[PDB]
């Protein structure tokens, strides 16, 4: 009796055992990994056969990412974590002004479709200049 080929995990994506195989019984486990965009939720990630027909476990890694604050004008806003829940992005203000706000920003979540705290800060011209006599 087994649980039947494995499905497919959009939560997730295959990461060895030889697909060589059709059956394994209960008590099998594989392995799988989580796609770049999972955050809070690590906890698990095996598929073992259960005693229902199927395959059963825990929702290890939920990806949740953060709306990009957008464009920094007079400035670039220092992305790359594709704005993953649990992450720190920081700030950049051009040459003839300095960052002010917050250079760090948070990727937070509330309720369920994650929830920012502060996007893009202050860029604002120093006290210093010399473009005109």
């Given at each position: 009796?087994?649980?039947?080929?494995?499905?497919?995990?959009?939560?997730?994506?295959?990461?060895?055992?030889?697909?060589?195989?059709?059956?394994?019984?209960?008590?099998?486990?594989?392995?799988?990994?989580?796609?770049?965009?999972?955050?809070r939720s690590h906890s698990t990630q095996t598929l073992t056969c259960n005693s229902d027909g199927e395959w059963v476990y825990n929702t290890f890694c939920i990806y949740?990412?953060?709306?990009?604050?957008?464009?920094?004008?007079?400035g670039?806003?220092?992305?790359?974590?594709?704005?993953?829940?649990?992450?720190?992005?920081?700030?950049s203000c051009s040459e003839g002004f300095f960052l002010i706000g917050s250079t760090t920003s948070r990727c937070e979540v509330q309720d369920r479709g994650v929830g920012w705290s502060h996007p893009l800060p202050q860029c604002e011209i120093l006290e210093h200049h010399h473009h005109h006599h």
């Open positions: 009796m087994n649980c039947g080929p494995p499905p497919t995990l959009s939560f997730a994506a295959p990461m060895d055992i030889t697909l060589t195989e059709t059956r394994f019984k209960t008590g099998t486990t594989l392995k799988y990994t989580c796609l770049p965009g999972y955050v949740k990412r953060c709306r990009h604050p957008g464009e920094l004008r007079n670039q806003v220092e992305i790359k974590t594709d704005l993953s829940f649990g992450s720190q992005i920081e700030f």
